[PDB]
Design a protein around this nucleic acid. Structure first.
Lengths: 88, 62, 132, 98, 25, 217, 83
RNA sequence: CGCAAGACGGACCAGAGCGAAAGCAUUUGCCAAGAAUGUUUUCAUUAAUCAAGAACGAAAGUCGGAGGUUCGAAGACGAUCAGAUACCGUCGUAGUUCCGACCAUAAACGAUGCCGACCGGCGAUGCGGCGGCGUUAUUCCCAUGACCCGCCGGGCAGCUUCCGGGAAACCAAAGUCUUUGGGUUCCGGGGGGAGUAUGGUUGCAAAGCUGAAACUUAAAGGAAUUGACGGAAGGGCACCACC
């Protein structure tokens, strides 16, 4: 952001995930859920958070599929969007 | 890198395009508990010593 | 390639099966047995048969062979197969019993036994293998 | 003669799926029709992991993986020996090979 | 002869017949 | 067999079934075997109704004792579990044993050396012993089969619902039915228990044979 | 099973089978005596109510509509009635 | 590092869903619609299939605008080859994208018209409802979710079977067929000629729908079997193969 002298002082410009991890998370036979939030902080910083989420096969679950309903997914996405606006 | 000696503990199979190379489990007689799989020309029996001009390659198994 | 042909093995099996008691483990004695109890026109075939005979005799010393029969068949499948213990594994003091196996005994005449320990039921109804 | 009951693809109540481009060629293949692999793979095979572990800055560094999903046309797949012609009885086995 | 290219040749031949019948009208 | 005190299920016979586990059927169910089941457990096991097991045991025993020639009731098991039990059933009933590897065409091909031609088959498992059932289709052979909740009743002509999987339960069912045919012939009385032990008919793990040989000394 | 007693099925079988497919067509719904704790009187609610059942002068809401068997408000007891 | 424009919605994505079919996949909102379940709601035969007639109808193609990122018929060039107006490669106009009108065809396929009844089993799965031990979240329980175990109805399917059918492949429908008749629409009659000529009709055009005959011919074809062959896959053998 600025240089004092023999010192490049840095400021936040974006969190990211290593695609090693990002790809690792995305496996078949479960619902991938995403939510973006165009948000502003207290000071004049405008962020675009991207959440991600994966439905969990339960401990006693025998069924392979492990999917969600469309209204369940968009209730989750509405929650994600609410929580990320709340914490920014 | 030094020139080391390894003993044939087991001759696994016969690899090579014309089956011309014995594929061999070699035990390093310097570091007596380090073992690798390694391709060898000519007739090899169990318990003859190979002269390795490097000890860092490892052959791909049958 | 020292694989014995059907003519060697069939002959060698029948020679053991019919003249078991005349044979032993030595090659050279049962070579001369095979000379007497069979009319073999070759010397080489005589040796082949005598050789496989001796191999099957060593196999019979270990245990019973799939393609031959011994006279009693044979003190283990006949005599030892008449094994009887002191008391049967059936004759149990405390027989554990399911609550629903207790119910079908109650809808039988046998609603009250002395030696049936009715157990607590299997909670967490989870008994299958997951799919895929 | 009808060779495959499913017709060699996996649509039963659609009548259309979207074409994928075959990775080897550029052939347009129905998604359900395409022979799909999911190759997880270590960025270095066997000879280079020996060298990285020794020349790593870090303390017992777990190496990252390279997650491709390959889509093949039937021709590419058979030529590259991904799938393979089977006997008319053995065709019906939908079990993936071990 | 592929039945599609047969159908293409019969269309061109028709298209020349409609071109030559028109010149008397 | 029905509404008779003489041939009614006794108290000691229930304890021989509960120890053996002949009531304790498989996880899966055949539609032809829903009538020979009391109820399903929690932890997916079907409980066989032992009264109906007992009536099918008597009906089978009747079928065997009706066969005037005791020799031509061919008794079959392929699986190790039955191979002892069926061989001791031959000793008792005077039946013909085929213990392991039923050669196809032993009922159909004359020129075969082991060409048997019975009046009645007895079968330890309709699935394992599918080949005897199928050759009973080609020659008019009624078939008694020791059946599980899982077993299909294709070509089986009187089914005895059991655990035919477990080592004890098989040998016990063979013992029960050997003792019943000898009772119903009038060879043995019914008041006293039978000299032959039900434990005799049980197949043993070759581990257990060398474990007994170790524990005998 | 060839010989099914279609004349006389066991009650377990007809309770299992679809309402229209039974030997004699019989509904799976019922009426029930429902009472809220505020009001005295007992209103007859239909099991599959499909309307917001109120008491006299709306003392409270009793029955909320759902897919099938309508849910009764927490604190409202019911006895199913027969003839 | 940015910025712009125009395409397209990977992975999740399935023998999963929805739609009459063509077809449909980023988020959010609005607009109407729909199957299925639930119902001790209502009307009371209002139905099924359908000449005429009508809506929708992939892609390509056409006409007028807006746009043109990528790809790319035609074209030009470089290669290969004997030639190579191909396959390969670099460019590249129409087109590909959007709106308004045409067009009415596809291997538009499940190559299987629609409605109704009956005739084995089993495990799944999608939707809705019903019942049931137990785990789990909202903790503060209620009741709702996530599971588990079953039942019912409708759905895409699956496996198995001497139901039965079929020339067979195969088909719980392609069965209930010489023991031939539940209702109804379309349509085939050896192979070519030919979906041609001709007339009509629709279209701006391309072309669509309707549509013969003369003549010619003993087979064309379907399913399956055995061989031979392969520039398909795998296995084995030989110093008339190799190392």
């Amino acid at each position: 952001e600025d240089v004092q002298g023999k010192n490049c002082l840095t400021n936040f410009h974006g969190m990211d995930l290593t695609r090693d991890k990002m790809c690792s998370m995305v496996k078949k036979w479960q619902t991938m859920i995403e939510a973006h939030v165009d948000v502003k902080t207290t000071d004049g910083y405008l962020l675009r958070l991207f959440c991600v989420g994966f439905t969990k096969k339960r401990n006693n679950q025998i069924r392979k599929t492990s999917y969600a309903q469309h209204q369940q997914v968009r209730q989750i996405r509405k929650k994600m969007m609410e929580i990320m606006t709340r914490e920014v | 890198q030094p020139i080391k000696l390894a003993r044939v503990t087991k001759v696994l199979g016969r690899t090579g395009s014309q089956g011309q190379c014995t594929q061999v489990r070699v035990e390093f007689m310097d570091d007596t508990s380090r073992s690798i799989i390694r391709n060898v020309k000519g007739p090899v029996r169990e318990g003859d010593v190979l002269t390795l001009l490097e000890s860092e390659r490892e052959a791909r198994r049958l | 390639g020292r694989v014995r042909t059907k003519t060697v093995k069939k002959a060698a099996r029948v020679i053991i099966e019919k003249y078991y008691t005349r044979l032993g483990n030595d090659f050279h004695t049962n070579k001369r047995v095979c000379e007497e109890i069979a009319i073999i026109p070759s010397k080489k075939l005589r040796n082949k048969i005598a050789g496989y005979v001796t191999h099957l005799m060593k196999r019979i010393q270990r245990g019973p062979v799939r393609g031959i029969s011994i006279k009693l068949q044979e003190e283990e499948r006949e005599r030892r197969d008449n094994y009887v213990p002191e008391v049967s594994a059936l004759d149990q003091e405390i027989i554990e019993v399911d609550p629903d196996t207790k119910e079908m005994l109650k809808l039988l005449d046998f609603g009250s036994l002395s030696n049936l320990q009715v157990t607590q039921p299997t909670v967490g109804m989870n008994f299958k293998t997951p799919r895929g | 003669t009808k060779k495959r009951r499913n017709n060699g693809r996996a649509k039963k109540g659609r009548g259309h799926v979207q074409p994928i481009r075959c990775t080897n060629c550029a052939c347009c293949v129905p998604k359900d029709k395409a022979i799909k692999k999911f190759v997880i793979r270590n960025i270095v095979e066997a000879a280079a992991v020996r060298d990285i572990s020794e020349v790593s800055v870090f303390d017992a560094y777990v190496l990252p993986k390279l997650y491709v999903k390959l889509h093949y046309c039937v021709s590419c797949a058979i030529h590259s020996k991904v799938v393979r012609n089977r006997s008319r009885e053995a065709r019906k086995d939908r079990t993936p090979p071990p | 002869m592929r039945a599609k290219w047969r159908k293409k040749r019969m269309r061109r031949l028709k298209r020349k017949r409609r071109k030559m019948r028109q010149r008397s009208k | 067999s029905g509404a008779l005190d003489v041939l009614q299920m006794k108290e000691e016979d229930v304890l021989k079934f509960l120890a053996a586990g002949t009531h304790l059927g498989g996880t899966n169910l055949d539609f032809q075997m829903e009538q020979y089941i009391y109820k399903r457990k929690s932890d997916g096991i079907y409980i066989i109704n032992l009264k109906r097991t007992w009536e099918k045991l008597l009906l089978a025993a009747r079928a065997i004792v009706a066969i005037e020639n005791p020799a031509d009731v061919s008794v079959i098991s392929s699986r190790n579990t039955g191979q002892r039990a069926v061989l001791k059933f031959a000793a008792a009933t005077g039946a013909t044993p085929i213990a392991g590897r039923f050669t196809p065409g032993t009922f159909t091909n004359q020129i075969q050396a082991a060409f048997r031609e019975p009046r009645l088959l007895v079968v330890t498992d309709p699935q394992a012993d599918h080949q005897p059932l199928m050759e009973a289709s080609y020659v008019n052979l009624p078939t008694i089969a020791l059946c599980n909740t899982d077993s299909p009743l294709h070509y089986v002509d009187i089914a005895i619902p059991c655990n035919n999987k477990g080592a004890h339960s098989v040998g016990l069912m063979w013992w029960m039915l050997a003792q019943e045919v000898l009772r119903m012939r009038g060879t043995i009385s019914r008041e006293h228990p039978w000299e032959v032990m039900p434990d005799l008919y049980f197949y043993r793990d070759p581990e257990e044979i060398e474990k007994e040989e170790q524990a005998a000394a | 099973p060839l010989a099914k007693d279609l004349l006389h099925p066991s009650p377990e079988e007809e309770k299992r089978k679809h309402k229209k497919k039974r030997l004699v067509q019989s509904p799976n719904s019922y009426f029930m005596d429902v009472k809220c704790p505020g009001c005295y009187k007992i209103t007859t609610v239909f099991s599959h109510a499909q309307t917001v059942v109120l008491c006299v002068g709306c003392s409270t809401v009793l029955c909320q509509p759902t897919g099938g068997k309508a849910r009764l408000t927490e604190g409202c007891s019911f006895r199913r009635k027969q003839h």
